[PDB]
Amino acid sequence: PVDFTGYWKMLVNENFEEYLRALDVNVALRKIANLLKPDKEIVQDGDHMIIRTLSTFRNYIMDFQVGKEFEEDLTGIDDRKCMTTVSWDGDKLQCVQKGEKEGRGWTQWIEGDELHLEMRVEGVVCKQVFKKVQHHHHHH
Ligand SMILES: C=C(C)[C@@H]1CCC(C)=C[C@H]1c1c(O)cc(O)cc1CCCCC
Secondary structure, eight states: OOOOOEEEEEEEEESHHHHHHHTTOOHHHHHHHHHOOOEEEEEEETTEEEEEEEOSSOOEEEEEETTOOEEEEEHHHHSEEEEEEEEEETTEEEEEEESSSTTOEEEEEEETTEEEEEEEETTEEEEEEEEEEOOOOOOO
């Protein structure tokens, strides 16, 4: 049984600016956003999952039930909202973000001490890897 609970620090973030360009994020904000190295704080509580992407620039909080479609407010990212469903696919977590953009979603999984996150839109792929960490810090 896969359990994503933990605190995770960004190690790599590959091709994020092109992913943001495919979302039509303005160039100045793409530059700002790709300098950020947010942590992830995840609590998996039965089928209720909370994924907190944490940085001093901004926190983005996902709070959902696996298998239940919900309205995801991404307006601070790319001025859009999606109808999002997160589901198990073997040992991976699959997210489909239905909306104006084609093929928008992500896939998350664990390898050893690494949290792997692949995000996609319009055929453009960004890959992030985080390392599991144990020193915790307070966030709001
Ligand atoms: C909430 C944030 C820290 C920022 C907010 C601004 C943008 C354009 C992207 C987010 C971002 C970022 O700059 C780096 C990331 O690794 C992840 C995310 C969250 C949104 C991901 C989907 C675009």
